Amino acid sequence: MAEPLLVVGLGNPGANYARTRHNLGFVVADLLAARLGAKFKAHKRSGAEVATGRSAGRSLVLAKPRCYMNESGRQIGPLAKFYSVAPANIIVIHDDLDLEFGRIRLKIGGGEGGHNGLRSVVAALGTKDFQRVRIGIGRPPGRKDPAAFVLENFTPAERAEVPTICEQAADATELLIEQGME
């Protein structure tokens, strides 16, 4: 409420992953930065790229790890400190295997739903009590390993809705920032 907020979109750096299921977080962070009219820059003290701005009269810090998914948490801890943000005010956006495609849910705490990015964060923060904006991608077909599923692009049908879904996730995040969780 004077407390700065750290919104983190998870994903993998590199053109080959920009469209994969596991990068929705990056996509949403990109939208939020655009809405804020703020751009990303390499942050010397973390390794992630950051952009800053205002939302709901709140001071905002948007970031996207430049490290691969498993090393996400190690870039977040340092950012939290640099801006002195508490875990509770850290908002992580991520794809979620346990939510049907396009289904968006908010939560603080809870499990990782088999998400490796989420685990490195818990591991790095020493706590599961940070905020999450869960964007459902549904379960993987039996013919596809879960880890491979999230690293592959959305199906033609799903692809047509992803942009819309991300707008909604961006909106949810803003709303969560406005009077979120409780």
Swiss-Prot record:
It is an enzyme of class 3 (hydrolase). TRNA binds at residues 17, 68, 70, 116. The record marks 12 as: Discriminates between blocked and unblocked aminoacyl-tRNA. The active site is at 22 (proton acceptor). Disruption phenotype: Essential, it cannot be deleted. Depletion experiments lead to decreased growth. Depletion experiments lead to accumulation of peptidyl tRNAs, in particular all 3 peptidyl-prolyl-tRNA(Pro)s, a reduction in usable aminoacyl tRNA pools and hypersensitivity to macrolide antibiotics that target the 50S subunit. GO terms for cellular component: cytoplasm; plasma membrane. It catalyses: an N-acyl-L-alpha-aminoacyl-tRNA + H2O = an N-acyl-L-amino acid + a tRNA + H(+); N-acetylglycyl-tRNA(Gly) + H2O = N-acetylglycine + tRNA(Gly) + H(+). The record marks 95 as: Stabilizes the basic form of H active site to accept a proton. Pfam families: Pept_tRNA_hydro. Changing residue 12 to D: Does not complement an E.coli temperature-sensitive (ts) mutation. SUPFAM superfamilies: Peptidyl-tRNA hydrolase-like. Gene3D superfamilies: Peptidyl-tRNA hydrolase. Keywords: Cytoplasm, Hydrolase, RNA-binding, tRNA-binding. It is found in: Cytoplasm. Induction: Constitutively expressed (at protein level). Might be a good antibiotic target especially in combination with antibiotics that targets 50S ribosmal subunits (macrolides) or target peptidyl tRNA drop off (lincosamide clindamycin and aminonucleoside puromycin). It comes from the Bacteria. InterPro entries: Pept_tRNA_hydro, Pept_tRNA_hydro_CS, Pept_tRNA_hydro_sf. Belongs to the PTH family. Hydrolyzes ribosome-free peptidyl-tRNAs (with 1 or more amino acids incorporated), which drop off the ribosome during protein synthesis, or as a result of ribosome stalling. Catalyzes the release of premature peptidyl moieties from peptidyl-tRNA molecules trapped in stalled 50S ribosomal subunits, and thus maintains levels of free tRNAs and 50S ribosomes. This is Peptidyl-tRNA hydrolase. It comes from Mycobacterium tuberculosis (strain ATCC 25618 / H37Rv). The lineage of its organism: Bacteria, Bacillati, Actinomycetota, Actinomycetes, Mycobacteriales.
